[PDB]
C-alpha cells in the first residue's frame, strides 16, 4: 500500500449555463486543465502520467468516446498517456480522484491525473434510433442537460423524480426550511465572492484563453431578500428555487496525483494526502443524503471523526440537500463547511464538481498549514462519494 498525494489541483472558473464557457467544447475544457496542470508544474513531464481519469456525467456530446483520453491528446500530451472516463453522475469528478488514488495506492500508477469536466451548456440532444424502418410515431429528442432521459419503464417511478423534486422531499423529511436553504445559499455566494476577491482561488484557477472569467460566473452579489423573493422551482408550495439550488454550469478541474516518488519527480510539494474514500448509495429519491454514509465511511477509514476536520467540502447541489447532509452529521463548525462557498454560487458542472471540491479542499488545507479535510458529493440516482484529505 502506497501513500497518495494531491500534488496540484487546478480548475477553470466555472461558466454559467449558456455563459462564458458555453462556447468551449467539454473535451477542450478537459484538455485545458491538463494543459494547465503541465504548465503549473514544469517538473511534470506529461509522459510520466500513468493514467488520466476524468469524471464526466454526460459524454454524449463533444466529450464523447472517453474525454480523458481525448483531453490528453488535445492537451498535446504524449500518446503514451492513457485516459479513462468515469461516470458516477454528479460525483464523477470525485470518482476520478478516487480512481486515480486507488491506481497509485496499489502501485498500478505513480502519477495520475484525476479530472472532472462538464459542459452542461453543450450537453447535446440524444435521439434513439428506430428498431424498424419507417417508424411512424413522434419520438422524443432527449436533452442530456438535466435529469432523466430515455427512462427505463421498469425503473420505479419514485426514483425517476427530478433532483429538485427529490430534494424537496429530503427538505420536507429533514425539516430544511426555505429560510435555512436561502441562508445557506446566501452564504455560498458570500463566501465564494469573498474567496475570489481575496485571491483564495488564485492558486487553483486556470483561465481559458479568450474566455476568461473574473470569478465563477454563477457567483452573484445577492441578498436574503433577493433569494427569499424567488419562486419555488419544483413545487408551487416548494422551498427549492433557482437561488438555493446549484446552477447548471460548464467547467473542468484536474488534480495532479502521485505517490511520494511522483511528488519529487514532478518537483511539487503535495497539497495534501488522500487518506481515504467512501462511497454510498441510497434510495434515488433521497439522493441528496447519498454522501452521509459515504463521509462516515471515509472518516472511519481515515481513523478520524467529525471533530478532527478543519475543512468540509460538501458539494451544494441544493442548499436543502447540503443542509440535510449536515443534519445527519454531527454538528460541524459552520466556518469549516464550504469555507469558500460552494456549487450554489460557484456552479455545478457535474463531472467537474467532485474533482473541484477535492482540489479546493487540498488547497484549503494547504492555506491552513495542515489538517483533515472531507470532501463529499451527492449523486443523482442516489449515491454519494467522500474523500478525506490530510495535510
Amino acid at each position: 500500500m502506497t501513500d497518495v498525494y494531491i500534488l496540484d489541483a487546478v480548475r477553470t472558473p466555472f461558466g454559467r449555463y449558456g455563459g462564458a464557457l458555453s462556447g468551449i467544447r467539454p473535451d477542450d475544457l478537459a484538455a485545458h486543465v491538463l494543459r494547465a496542470l503541465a504548465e503549473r508544474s514544469p517538473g511534470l513531464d506529461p509522459a510520466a502520467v500513468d493514467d488520466v481519469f476524468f469524471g464526466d456525467a454526460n459524454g454524449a456530446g463533444e466529450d464523447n468516446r472517453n474525454v480523458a483520453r481525448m483531453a490528453a491528446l488535445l492537451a498535446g500530451w504524449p500518446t503514451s498517456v492513457p485516459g479513462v472516463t468515469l461516470n458516477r453522475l454528479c460525483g464523477s469528478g470525485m470518482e476520478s480522484v478516487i480512481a486515480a488514488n486507488r491506481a497509485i495506492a496499489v502501485g498500478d500508477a505513480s502519477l495520475a491525473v484525476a479530472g472532472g469536466v462538464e459542459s452542461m451548456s453543450r450537453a447535446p440532444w440524444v435521439l434513439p434510433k428506430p428498431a424498424q424502418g419507417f417508424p411512424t410515431g413522434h419520438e422524443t429528442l432527449y436533452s442530456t442537460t438535466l435529469g432523466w432521459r430515455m427512462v427505463n419503464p421498469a425503473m420505479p417511478e419514485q426514483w425517476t423524480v427530478s433532483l429538485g423534486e427529490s430534494t424537496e422531499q429530503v427538505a420536507a423529511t429533514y425539516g430544511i426550511s426555505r429560510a435555512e436553504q436561502d441562508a445557506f445559499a446566501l452564504r455560498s455566494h458570500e463566501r465564494a465572492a469573498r474567496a475570489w476577491a481575496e485571491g483564495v482561488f488564485d492558486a487553483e484557477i486556470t483561465q481559458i484563453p479568450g474566455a476568461e472569467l473574473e470569478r465563477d460566473e454563477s457567483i452573484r452579489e445577492t441578498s436574503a431578500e433577493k433569494l427569499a423573493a424567488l419562486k419555488p422551482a419544483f413545487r408551487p408550495d416548494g422551498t427549492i428555487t433557482a437561488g438555493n439550488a446549484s446552477p447548471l454550469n460548464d467547467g473542468a478541474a484536474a488534480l495532479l496525483i502521485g505517490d511520494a516518488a511522483a511528488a519529487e519527480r514532478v518537483g511539487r510539494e503535495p497539497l495534501a494526502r488522500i487518506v481515504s474514500r467512501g462511497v454510498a448509495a441510497v434510495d434515488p429519491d433521497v439522493f441528496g443524503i447519498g454522501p452521509v454514509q459515504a463521509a462516515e465511511i471515509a472518516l472511519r477509514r481515515a481513523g478520524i471523526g467529525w471533530d478532527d476536520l478543519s475543512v468540509v467540502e460538501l458539494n451544494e447541489a441544493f442548499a436543502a440537500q447540503s443542509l440535510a447532509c449536515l443534519k445527519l452529521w454531527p454538528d460541524l463548525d459552520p466556518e469549516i463547511v464550504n469555507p469558500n462557498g460552494g456549487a450554489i454560487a460557484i456552479g455545478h458542472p457535474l463531472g467537474a464538481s467532485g474533482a473541484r471540491i477535492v482540489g479546493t479542499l487540498a488547497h484549503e488545507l494547504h492555506r491552513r498549514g495542515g489538517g483533515w479535510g472531507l470532501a463529499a458529493i451527492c449523486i443523482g440516482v442516489g449515491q454519494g462519494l467522500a474523500v478525506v484529505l490530510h495535510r
Copy 2:
C-alpha cells in the same frame, strides 16, 4: 493489499448488430447480468455488493446517466448498491474489472461487480445544441454506433482515422497478410462454435428471457474460401474485411469480484485470482497494438513471463490487430490465444468485451485446473488494457 478474486463471471450471448439482442436496452442488458450474478450465487446478498463497475463505451442511449447504478436498481438490488460507469472505449469492460480489483485490493470494497455492457444496435443519434436560436444550415445528426463523432478540429487528423483504417496501417506495418487475418478469423469462428457446442460457455452464459440465443450470434459456420472471397472494408486494396474484423454487437458481461472475505460471505470458490493489470497507450492510429505494453506491464507485475501463461484472451477487434499483438509478443504461444475463439466470432459489444474476456479467461483457467491467464484488449484511440489472472 488484499488478494482479489473473480468469484463468478457471467455474460449474455452476444447479439449481432440489429440482431437477437437489439431489442434489449443496454441498461437492461447490464441489469440482466447483475440478476444472473445474483441468481448464480445464492449466497450473494446483493446488499453485500460494495460497488458496481460497468464498462460502457457509449452510454448516450438507454444506458445513460451511469448504467452501472441504473443496472443495479433495475436488477432489483438494494438502493444501497453504488454503481459507476467507466469508459475506456473498447477496453471499458476490462477497465471496470481493474477498477473493481483496485477498490477491493485497497480495502475500499470487499465485494464488487465489474461488468461491461454495450448495445451497439441501440447506439443513439446525438444532435449538438445550437449556441444561438434559429440556426440556419443543415446539421449533422451523429450516430454513436461507430467511429469518431463531433470531432474536435484540433484533434490531429492522423488520430481520427477509422479503427479499420488504423488496423490496415498496422496490418501493413507488421506484415499481417490477408490470408493470415482470415486464418485467424476462421479459427475464431471454429473455436467459438466448438466451445458453444461442447458446453464450454455454459459456465459463463446467462440467457435473456424472450431473447435467448443458441450461441453468440456473430458465430458463423465459415471457411477460408468464404473469408478470402470477401471484399475489403476500408481500402479498395485492403486486407480488412467484415470477416476478419469483429462485428458490432450487443451484450453484457459481469464478474462478481471479491476478496477472501467476500468469497466466504458469498459462499463461492474463486474462479481465479486477479493478480495484476496493465494499461498502455500508443499513437491512436496504431491502437491495435495498444495492449502490447499493457500485457508486458501486467506480466511484469505478476512476476511471470509469457511461457507461464496457459491461456491468453486477446480481444479480437480485428484479426490483423490481434495478429500484430502476437507478433509484438514473440514469446507467446499463439495456440493458447483465444482457445474458445474471440470477438471476431463471438462479437465485440465494446463495453462488454473487456469484461467478457476476463470472465471467460477465469472460466478457462477453471476448466484447465489452474494456471496463469492473460486477458488483453486494444482500445480505439490508442490504448490497451491487460489483466493477469491466476487460478
Copy 3:
C-alpha cells in the same frame, strides 16, 4: 365557361406503408406519373402543359419545395412547364384536379396536369428549431406520417383528435356498426381485388420500373371473419380497426386535363368532362362527413341529383367515415359507390387519393360508356371536396 375534360388519368399501384414503393422518393413517384402521362399520350408535347398541379398533404420530405415543379423537372419535362403543389390534406389530389379544372375553365390554361402524390412511408421527421441557444428541455421529433403535429396550443383540443378517434365518434353518432364497417371494408377488398384481376385498373396503372406491384399492395384476401377478429385501433371498445380503416400508403396519380383545344392538340378523346366541384368544411372532429355538403354542392352545380349518378368514388378514409357519408346521402345508392373498391384496400396515400379517385371515376365512366360520376373525399381537419364528372 370553357368545358374541361379529363384527357388521361394514370396512377402508380399504391404501395403499403413501408412496402413496395417505400423506397421511391415522393418526387420520383410524382415524376413517374408525369413520365407515364407523357408516354401514354404520344400526341402530348409536355411543353404544351400549361401548369402542373400536385396535391401533396406532406411535402416535408423529399417532395419538398413544390413537388409539382420538381416532378416536372425530374420527369424530363421542359423547364417551361410550371408546377404548383396544393395541400388540402387528404383531399389535396382532388384539390389539384379542381385547381387545374379552374385554370382551364377560366382560360388561364388549356392543358394542365393535376396529380397527387404521397410517400407516407418516407414521411420524414420534423424537428422545430429552438428560438434561443442551448435549449434545455426534451424536444418532440414530430413524425409527419400521421396525425397532428406541432399542435398550436390555441387550437381547440376537440379538433386535434386523431382521424380514427374522430371517425369513432362519427361511427357512434350515425350508428355505423363494426359489422357494417367490416362489410364495407370487405366489399372494398373484394371489389379492388376483382377490379385488378379483371384488368379494370390496367387503363389507369403505370408501374414504377423496378418497383412493380401486381396490384395495390394493401389489397388483401380477407373475409368477414378476419375483419371481425381485428382488434379496435382507437378505443378498447372501438369499432375502427386497421382492417376497416384505410392504410397508410405510397403512391402518385396524375390526370391530364384539358379543354377541347387541348384534347385535339394532345390527340386524346376525353375520358370525362369535369362538370363541377364542391368544397365544404365541418367541425374537424367530424371530418369524415366533410364531403357530404361538398358533394351536394357539386351535384347542384352540375344540375344533377344523386339519382343521376352511375358511379360514386367516395374516398375510403375509414369504412365508418364512408358509411356515415352514405347515411347522410340517403338518395345515394350505396351500391354504386366504389365499384372497383376504395382506399381501404387500394390504399390512401393522402395526396394521391383525391386525384386517383377522380381519375378512376373517369376511367370507370369511360368503361361504362358514359354517365355522371361523383368523386368525393373527406379531409383531415374537417373538410371535403367533391367533383362531378360526366362522360
Copy 4:
C-alpha cells in the same frame, strides 16, 4: 366569367429572420391576418368566406397540415370555412391570390381569402426516416430555412444551385452591375422607409399584439456607401450581397377577394379588380427572370401593354433579379416599379410576398384613384407569377 375584386388586403409588418416575428408561429401569423381581415370589414361574416387560400413555401413546421385551414380555425372563423395551402415556392402567396381569383371567376366561390404566410425564422429541421432499423452512419438534419434539401440525385446539378448563385449568373448574363443592384436596393430601403413614415402602409398593416413593429424590420437607414461596402455573398468576385438581396423574413398577408355580390355582402368597396394572371417557368438556374413571360401573358390577357401600367410590384428577391426582369421588360418604365420599396427592404417571407405585393398594389391603385397595376414574382425553381389589377 365573373369579375373578381380585392375587397381588402392586409399584412403583418415583416420581421427579419430571428427578429420581431420570430416568436410567432406561422399558423398564428396566418391566423392573425385572418383575424385582421375580419376586424377590418365588420360587414364580413367569416362564414361567408367560401375558401381560404394560403401560399406557404414551407409548411414543414407549425404551419403544417394545411395552414390555410388551420389559420381559419385559429382565427375563430366558423369550421364551415374551408382552407387550402398552396406551394409555388416564392410565388405561393400570389399563387393563392390566383387560386382564389379563379375560384370566384368560375363561380365556385363568391368570397375567398387569398393569403400568404412564411415563418422562415421557425423553418424547422426535417430528418428523413430510416428505411431500415438501427441505421448506423451520421445523418443530415436538413434545415428548411433556405435552399435545396433532400436533393434528388436525378435533379440536374445545374438546377440545384442556390438562388443567389443563379441570380449571379443572371446578373452576369444581363449585365447587372453591383452599383445598379445597390442603387435598386438603396431605393427599395428609401422608398419603404418613406412609405412607412408617410403612413402609406398603414392602410394594409395589421400589428401582431405583443409583437408590434414600427415598420418592416428589414428596412434600414442605409446608403450607397454602406451597400457598396458589403462583401459578396455567393462568389468571391460576386455582385450579390446581403444588402442587394432580400432578407429571410417572417410575415403573413391576406387579401379578401370577392365578386361584386361578395363586395356588397361584406359592405366593402373593392380596392381593385383582379383582371388577369400569368404563370411562366424557366430553367431553374435563371429563376430570377421567371416572371418575365408571366407578366407578358398577364398583360396580354388584361388587354394592355406596359404603357398602361401606373404601378408595378415586382417582388425583390434580388436587386439583380429585379433589374434583369426590368431589363427584359423594355417597355416598362422602371420608375413605377415598387414605388413604396420592395422585398430587399420590406423583407421576403416567401409565402407571404406574393400576397403582399398583390395586396399592396391594390392599395397603391386605390391610393391613386385607379389605374392598371402589375404584380410579378420570381420563383425559386424557375417559375414566375404575375397578376394584373385594375381599379
